[PDB]
Symmetry: none
Subunit: 70 residues, 2 copies
Amino acid sequence: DEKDHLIERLYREISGLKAQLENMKTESQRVVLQLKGHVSELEADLAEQQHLRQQAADDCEFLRAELDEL
Amino acid sequence: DEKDHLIERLYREISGLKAQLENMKTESQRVVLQLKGHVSELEADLAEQQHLRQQAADDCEFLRAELDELRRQREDTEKAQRSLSEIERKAQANEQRYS
């Protein structure tokens, strides 16, 4: 015993940090994936709705023409 | 002494693990926040589109009805024409018949 304890003590701490790092890495990924997924869903949704908009916009515009014509 | 070397190494491993960790905490915070805002920007961009779509949708419905009515008018005017006309072009077509 002596410096040997300082050694064991330090090894214990290192062992801790490594463990810490891993958990935070796992936790960070479990979230960034879930957030990215939600994002990709929305992007999709937006594209579809963004399309329907243009569709209806063009529609009325042509209807407005067909009318204003006759 | 030989253990002094090992002690020095361990203290350096630790200081590095702490930085390594720290960075991660920081990056994770940034990344997660940025995404969360991206969601909000879309959570909204979407409403934006659903709104304009709907707004335009029933907008055409109205026009579509405007058109049906005008077509109804033309249609009924014709029926009255090809009906009252058949009566005349068969009454005066009847007068000459007796000559």
